[PDB]
Design a binder for this molecule. Sequence first.
Ligand code: COH
Ligand code: COH
Ligand SMILES: *[C@@H]1O[C@H](CO)[C@@H](O[C@@H]2O[C@H](CO)[C@@H](O[C@H]3O[C@H](CO)[C@@H](O)[C@H](O)[C@@H]3O)[C@H](O)[C@H]2NC(C)=O)[C@H](O)[C@H]1NC(C)=O
Ligand SMILES: *[C@@H]1O[C@H](CO)[C@@H](O[C@@H]2O[C@H](CO)[C@@H](O[C@H]3O[C@H](CO)[C@@H](O)[C@H](O)[C@@H]3O)[C@H](O)[C@H]2NC(C)=O)[C@H](O)[C@H]1NC(C)=O
Ligand code: BOG
Ligand code: FLF
Ligand code: FLF
Ligand code: NAG
Ligand code: NAG
Ligand code: NH4
Ligand code: NH4
Ligand code: NH4
Ligand code: NH4
Ligand code: NH4
Ligand code: NH4
Ligand code: NH4
Ligand code: NH4
Ligand code: NH4
Lengths: 551, 551
Amino acid sequence: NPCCSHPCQNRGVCMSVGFDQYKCDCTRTGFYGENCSTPEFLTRIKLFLKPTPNTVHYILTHFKGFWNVVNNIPFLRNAIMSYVLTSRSHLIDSPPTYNADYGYKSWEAFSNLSYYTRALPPVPDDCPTPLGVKGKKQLPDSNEIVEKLLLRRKFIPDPQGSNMMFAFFAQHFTHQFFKTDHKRGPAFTNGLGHGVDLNHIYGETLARQRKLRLFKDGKMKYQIIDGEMYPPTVKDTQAEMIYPPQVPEHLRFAVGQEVFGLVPGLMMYATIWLREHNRVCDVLKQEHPEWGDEQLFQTSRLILIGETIKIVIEDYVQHLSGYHFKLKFDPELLFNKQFQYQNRIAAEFNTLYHWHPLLPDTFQIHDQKYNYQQFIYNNSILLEHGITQFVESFTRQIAGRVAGGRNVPPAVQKVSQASIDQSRQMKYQSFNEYRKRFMLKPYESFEELTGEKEMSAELEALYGDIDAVELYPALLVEKPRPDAIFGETMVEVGAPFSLKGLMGNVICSPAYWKPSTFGGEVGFQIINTASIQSLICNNVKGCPFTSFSVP
Amino acid sequence: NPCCSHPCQNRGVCMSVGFDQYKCDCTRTGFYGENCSTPEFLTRIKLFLKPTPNTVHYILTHFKGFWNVVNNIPFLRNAIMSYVLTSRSHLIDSPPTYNADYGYKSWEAFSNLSYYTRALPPVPDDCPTPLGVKGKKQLPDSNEIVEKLLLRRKFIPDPQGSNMMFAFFAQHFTHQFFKTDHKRGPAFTNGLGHGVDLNHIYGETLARQRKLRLFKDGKMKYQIIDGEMYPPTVKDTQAEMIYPPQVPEHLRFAVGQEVFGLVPGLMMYATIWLREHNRVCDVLKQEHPEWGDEQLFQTSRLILIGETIKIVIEDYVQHLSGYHFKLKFDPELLFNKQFQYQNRIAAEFNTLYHWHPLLPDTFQIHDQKYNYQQFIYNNSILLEHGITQFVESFTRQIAGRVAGGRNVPPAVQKVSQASIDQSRQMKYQSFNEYRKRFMLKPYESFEELTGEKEMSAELEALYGDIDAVELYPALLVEKPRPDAIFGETMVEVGAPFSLKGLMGNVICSPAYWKPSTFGGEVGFQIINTASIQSLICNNVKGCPFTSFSVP
Ligand code: COH
Ligand code: COH
Ligand SMILES: *[C@@H]1O[C@H](CO)[C@@H](O[C@@H]2O[C@H](CO)[C@@H](O[C@H]3O[C@H](CO)[C@@H](O)[C@H](O)[C@@H]3O)[C@H](O)[C@H]2NC(C)=O)[C@H](O)[C@H]1NC(C)=O
Ligand SMILES: *[C@@H]1O[C@H](CO)[C@@H](O[C@@H]2O[C@H](CO)[C@@H](O[C@H]3O[C@H](CO)[C@@H](O)[C@H](O)[C@@H]3O)[C@H](O)[C@H]2NC(C)=O)[C@H](O)[C@H]1NC(C)=O
Ligand SMILES: CCCCCCCCO[C@@H]1O[C@H](CO)[C@@H](O)[C@H](O)[C@H]1O
Ligand SMILES: O=C(O)c1ccccc1Nc1cccc(C(F)(F)F)c1
Ligand SMILES: O=C(O)c1ccccc1Nc1cccc(C(F)(F)F)c1
Ligand SMILES: *[C@@H]1O[C@H](CO)[C@@H](O)[C@H](O)[C@H]1NC(C)=O
Ligand SMILES: *[C@@H]1O[C@H](CO)[C@@H](O)[C@H](O)[C@H]1NC(C)=O
Ligand SMILES: [N+]
Ligand SMILES: [N+]
Ligand SMILES: [N+]
Ligand SMILES: [N+]
Ligand SMILES: [N+]
Ligand SMILES: [N+]
Ligand SMILES: [N+]
Ligand SMILES: [N+]
Ligand SMILES: [N+]
């Protein structure tokens, strides 16, 4: 297959014509030629005026006093934020295109919501190498990659100061749209909403939602333990959860996402958001004593979806970017712009979000330590310390650096290896192919990638060719930005997927983004004043200080 | 419920505030005030300058010499067509909002694809009258309405000259997205693609697609009967169909849509489109001898989707409109515009498309006459005459006038009664409400509605209040445009639903609309040169002349 070499550049569509020839479709690429390499006149101007992402990152992470003024000039802040959204979103195809089984556009790939979609098509089946033509006939042994390049020696904390509040928020929030159906294989998802629908609170199906709801005052079922609200039990809801048999029946908490029993950190956030739901129910009953249970529940869900997107943009991504520029959640920014209010979760977005180097060596709650053997599937820890102590503790505990390499804990070693194996099953193109897909310069050497001698040598010994390095491994060994948590590629690939899932939500569309959608101005204001601190303050006893960075 | 009277004007959203008050949300309506009835300044200017629909319709249906010139000035014709697409599409909320069970915006209404969506929300179930506050406490007997106002006495031919090729194309085409799940109720659909996916050829599910395919050269199963290609049978495919016990096995043809055995006119188009898929397979194999069966099938389906949109816009809606301006299917018209490439089928779109008055009292094939008892579920008629004969006969046979009243054949009398009854189950608002929803002045009298005295008196005796007249009856008795098949409301309410389903298709999006999507220029050109005449010429023996109107 002539397209195995990935000849077409700049988003050109490679199509085989005959057995030994190929064609490139350069339509609206801004280029022409056999391989869509020759820039058009306009493209040539743009390409010359366009700054490198590293430049843009320098500018955004510097000149603090300037940004603090820009942030307070609504016309400027809005104009900038609006550009961030439109420009990054242009990198995602929407409606979506390829999936694991289709390197060409097809109706099966478009319409079948059980697939993750794909930003780059799969390497065709009959190719010289796994990645196409580059690399050896067989990719290196995955466990060797982990040990040599990813496995943690000594803990490397995050220079940006990310804490466990941040790490578990990342895990909790993304696991509503990262829900791969492993009975089927890594190419499939159970999250058919394909974004921020809060199914990890309310359940994926109406059947599960009905088991978790109280059907009084719009509320969700709960227990009162030690004078505080917790999730209901599997016994009381009949909502299936994943628990090893060791777990006693009373500690089997039931929440929207089957798997959130895995760690108390997840169940901490499930509890916090559950409280928030029932709190907003109380607020809306005041505003609407005439409302029934159903409308109270639905309107609370829509408000909580708003809070989530609000908090994710203005607190979580804000922290994660390190920008002095204050990011904004404002759907009105896009009303005069071209933008598709839909989304489809990309498998590559799932792959890049395996931030297990975030995880510490031990989990430190109050004046105690817990190893993974003790921490996993142990909600006894959650009831013992309470949410307040959990927030106090997780706020102060530093997370690990994700880029730079050699920082995956041994406990989740096999998870990192699984990430590589599964991407091979799905036939991911190479790391450098994905760089080009998101308009980055491909690395010319293992050293340029790592900015370093050891790993770059280990890498060359494993792969040989720089164009043979796989997507997942390279992301974790890539040279981090100065004192940053991520390298260049993580940010430039990840941000477009993220923003599209966030602003592509139906509530951001003009038909929805009205106060009447959320019960009036009071409900609407809950969205637009939401923060990670306020989430904790309204729902955690004592209103402890919190933040996604260590004090 | 203070919203029962539908207080809020001009798209304002009504919301209860306490037990005895409401608030109108006027956001982006272009109005303000308690009921959103006060125009803003720009609104005042737009209203003053905007010509009425009947004025626009007059202009488009006169001055042929002028339009012949306009038609041949591409810059101009493109601008007009582009304007037609965007202005009509604005009348549809996309992503969708209400459904039968939600008069307020909710995640259930947005996310559950099993529902028909709703242009106007349902009337609350605790209102003083079934339509809100206007009209009597009980609605007229639906059988009375049908008999007094809708039932046919003498056939009334369509003045626009629509033939049976048109009537069965209408039925064939729309029943791919009008597929209500009566197991659940009228509010639910089995067409989860919500638009033009050609499931009525290939099947809704992958399981059904697999039964119908040949898995050789990307083709669909078929039979050769008297020299020509026909669809396969239930027995050979195992794809279930609806047939009465009378029909012998070997005549139980199996096609995408389960109900297309109901009438030979549908089975004709199913045959023609089946031939077209396999014809396109032959074309593509020649272009791509290296392609396997899968890519040949998928690429063929994408091409035929395009052919469908092409034909519907430039032949079907063209004829339908009565315009001298020449409509154009060109996804490029929208690439610089704001437009959502998605669609959700409106229940009201389904209701208004109940065009059973199109139907004759008898069906004339060649020199034979068939009444309903012998025409229904009779596929031997199809084998008897063959497709060429069917086309020639149907191209000649005139269809009935849809608007103007009293033109529903007695045979499908109960279907027309089911349409009224189901509207009431789903709590449709009134005709006048839907007129305001689509920016039409509400009718002040029944006489104004029908343009006559007789029918308007039955109407008044049945309903009492002009604001109590229901959507579906009013659509069919409404005064038709001069020598037209429809009145003002059918056109102005239906056109936006239609255009959104057509241009909102994924293939019309910029990522898909390019030659490589369709296997190159040869395939891309089958779409862009497709017409109802070429469809027939390529797949019907003898290449008989055809058209959507009688010679
Ligand atoms: C910030 C990101 C983050 C965090 C903090 C986190 C925290 C933790 C954690 C304890 C706190 C444990 C014990 C694990 C362990 C696992 N993780 Co993560 N995970 C994270 C991101 C992910 C993502 C993303 C996936 C893929 C889930 C999917 O695709 O469904 C994942 C998958 C897994 C799997 C599935 C294995 C497989 O074969 O795919 C295991 C096991 N893990 N992880
Ligand atoms: C638009 C043109 C058109 C035509 C020409 C047409 C021609 C014919 C025809 C013979 C030629 C027959 C025997 C029927 C008979 C029926 N039609 Co139509 N139908 C048409 C548009 C529709 C639509 C739209 C529906 C609703 C489909 C659905 O799934 O609800 C429909 C529904 C029906 C139903 C189901 C009614 C119910 O239970 O709700 C029957 C029976 N019929 N129709
Ligand atoms: C889209 O909306 C549909 C209508 O609400 C919904 O279908 C409904 O689903 C429920 C349960 O899923 C069915 O009722 C069930 O009720 C008892 C609970 O006590 C169960 O034990 C029963 O087994 C029964 O299944 C409703 O009958 C059903 N209604 C209809 C009209 O089909 C769909 O589930 C919604 N779709 C999604 C994806 O959520
Ligand atoms: C979305 O794509 C999925 C993957 O192709 C698809 O799932 C597949 O569905 C087929 C048929 O529905 C299954 O094949 C069946 O084949 C025989 C019956 O002849 C049985 O023995 C099998 O057990 C099975 O029922 C595939 O196994 C299945 N593949 C996977 C990975 O689940 C979905 O159906 C597609 N979604 C839609 C809405 O069409
Ligand atoms: C739980 C996260 C929700 C975000 C809301 C943050 C504010 C929480 O506090 C709220 O502040 C409002 C003013 O904005 C007041 O009107 C409310 O009375 C008060 O409850
Ligand atoms: O938001 C995520 O989930 C994200 C994930 C991975 C990588 C980058 C991510 N967001 C991000 C990172 C830097 C800058 C911006 C932007 F400012 F564009 F929003 C967004
Ligand atoms: O296209 C349909 O199926 C249609 C249905 C009902 C009513 C009008 C319809 N179309 C339509 C009727 C008149 C003019 C135009 C338009 F010109 F806008 F395209 C479209
Ligand atoms: C779970 O946590 C409790 C403390 O809350 C501890 O006593 C117990 O040993 C833990 N379980 C395991 C398996 O370590
Ligand atoms: C079906 O059509 C054929 C004509 O080919 C006719 O002989 C037969 O009587 C018809 N069936 C019925 C039930 O009328
Ligand atoms: N592409
Ligand atoms: N150029
Ligand atoms: N469940
Ligand atoms: N451990
Ligand atoms: N550093
Ligand atoms: N609305
Ligand atoms: N089937
Ligand atoms: N009949
Ligand atoms: N007329």
